[PDB]
Amino acid sequence: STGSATTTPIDSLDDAYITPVQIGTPAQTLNLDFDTGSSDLWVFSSETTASEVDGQTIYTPSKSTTAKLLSGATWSISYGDGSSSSGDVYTDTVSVGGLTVTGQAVESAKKVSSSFTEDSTIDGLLGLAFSTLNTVSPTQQKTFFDNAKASLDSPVFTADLGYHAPGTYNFGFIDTTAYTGSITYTAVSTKQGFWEWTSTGYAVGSGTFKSTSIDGIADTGTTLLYLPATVVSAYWAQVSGAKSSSSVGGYVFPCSATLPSFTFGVGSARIVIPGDYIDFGPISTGSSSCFGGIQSSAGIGINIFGDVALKAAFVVFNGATTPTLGFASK
């Protein structure tokens, strides 16, 4: 089997991407944030505290003839940005782009933090990291990808995120028309439950490539590119007037600037992030201070190849017995 779904930026900055997901019988379509940095499929629901729902589409398990309470199971998750949600668990039929899994754990939110409420465009998350990170207790549950894997033509999914445009998530096949050149594959460690890999270095603009190992994660659910402070300082030193602002919480730069590109290594290959991808616009409405798309990971404890990096590439999440990542230009 295969599936193919379009993923669409939630706003003009590509702060996140939503992908329609069918849940239940008859289908209830929710727009989920596909997140290769977590392993829970959780949704706004008929059980979510009413004051915490503000425009989201909800899953109502009582209207699904295939929904079953997973008795005793609860979930609770905290994200790197301080946001959180928790609740109980149903199994139900879940379809993405034509690919159907029966008996998928659908985690129904009873509570969500203010940030989730305030984002009307995101009806929940669909985790695509390793199932070892799934938060369901007392019986850990499998991701949608892990449940689909055995049925897929090839045990893979691909992320093809757009810059200020729709893109695609494919399951079970590699669309050879969606990238240029060849796919370079690189080793993955699953020890922390992430798609964790080692970049071979970087360049800033037309500068010379610096060979240096940068361990980090391929994370579609993180907006920005978080790298070591040395690398980030080297980038922003090429932008007149850029500075790290403690008050704003990262590197800012004059909105009048034209940003240099950023290149990262994948083995002997190179992925070039155009400068415009690194512009996240005014810090506050009408400001001439703009927020940078490359930020320090020093305060996180991991480097994160988020959307800024991944949307410059066609990315293969290879879930073969030994997982690997693939990157191609596009």
Stretch touching ligand A1CGT by CB under 6 A, among 18-26, 74-82, 130-138, 318-326: 74-82
CB burial class (10 A; 0-12, 13-18, 19+) of residue 62? Answer: exposed
CA distance between the termini of the chain:
25
- Told to check if 119 binds ligand A1CGT by CB under 6 A, we report yes
Among positions 59, 262, 280, 305, the unique one binding ligand A1CGT when judged by CB under 6 A: 280
Residues 122-151 that bind ligand A1CGT (CB under 6 A): 125
Task: Give the closest residue to 320 by CA, choosing from 172, 196, 143.
Answer: 172
- Asked if residues 271 and 260 have their Cβ atoms less than 8 Å apart, the reply is no
Among positions 2, 7, 16, 128, the unique one binding ligand A1CGT when judged by CB under 6 A: 16
- Three-state DSSP state, 270: strand
Q: At closest approach, how far in Å is the CB of 46 from ligand A1CGT?
A: 21
- Told to check if 303 binds ligand A1CGT by CB under 6 A, we report no
- Told to check if 248 binds ligand A1CGT by CB under 6 A, we report yes
User: Which CA distances in Å does 138 have to 44, 73, 118, 159?
Assistant: 22, 6, 30, 31
State which residue, 122 or 174, has the beta carbon closest to ligand A1CGT: 122
Catalytic residues: 35, 199
- Told to check if 305 binds ligand A1CGT by CB under 6 A, we report no
- Told to check if 75 binds ligand A1CGT by CB under 6 A, we report no
Q: How many residues bind ligand A1CGT (CB under 6 A)?
A: 25
Q: Beta partners for 295?
A: 226
Q: At closest approach, how far in Å is the CB of 277 from ligand A1CGT?
A: 12
Unique residue bearing structure tokens 């050879």 = 176
State which residue, 183 or 252, has the beta carbon closest to ligand A1CGT: 252
User: Which CA distances in Å does 144 have to 33, 91, 102, 153, 327?
Assistant: 13, 12, 10, 15, 22
User: Which CA distances in Å does 11 have to 8, 260, 330?
Assistant: 9, 23, 22
The amino acid at residue 11 is D
Residues 198-237 that bind ligand A1CGT (CB under 6 A): 221-224
State which residue, 59 or 291, has the beta carbon closest to ligand A1CGT: 291
Task: Tell me the C-alpha distance between 134 and 76, whole Å.
Answer: 10
Which residues are near ligand A1CGT by CB under 6 A?
Answer: 13, 15-16, 35, 37-38, 79-81, 83, 115-116, 119, 125, 221-224, 248-250, 280-281, 283, 291
